[PDB]
Amino acid sequence: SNSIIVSPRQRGNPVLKFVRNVPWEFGDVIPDYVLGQSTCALFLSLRYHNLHPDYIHGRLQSLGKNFALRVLLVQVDVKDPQQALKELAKMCILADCTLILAWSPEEAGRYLETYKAYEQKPADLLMEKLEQDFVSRVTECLTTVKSVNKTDSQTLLTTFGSLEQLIAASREDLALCPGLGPQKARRLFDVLHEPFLKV
């Protein structure tokens, strides 16, 4: 079932009209949305929160521990959400559910789509890339210095041919590199060849 199950109680909602990249249909479920197995969602609006103070608590208590990941996504439409957010976060901590903030119905629909679309997606997107290209590797090696950055590395590889040439360069020669400056060249030279041991 590659579709979102929507609770019948959300018939007159303005957010479920903003999901376009994934299909959805209605169904009798405890949470407002069922984004696959072990994942559910409950929609709240801070307006409905401060006109119905006890509505969300009952839903969160009746939702139960059936779903592993339970997301309480809210719409920040009021102008002063500081007080409501504190109580909502405390309630989420107590009830073991995740709080996600959307500032428009467009964002809530995108969150629903992403939760549905990422049912089996791995975590390789989150982890570091660490490109294996030689330019990328030498840039990463040169970046470890305090002040050397990507553009500095790029102009370093343009001036000196190989890393052997950069090593062979003297302190004054490194300082004379266009756009390097005295302090960055000095600290690179100090890093370039200093005894590994001691301190």
């Binding site: 609770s7 109680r9 959300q10 007159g12 909602n13 303005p14 957010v15 407002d32 409950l42 929609f43 709240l44 609006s45 307006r47 409905y48 929160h49 006109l51 119905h52 509505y55 969300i56």
Partner: peptide
């Protein structure tokens, strides 16, 4: 039952 929305 409210759904967290205002008609």
């Amino acid at each position: 039952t409210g759904g967290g929305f205002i008609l």
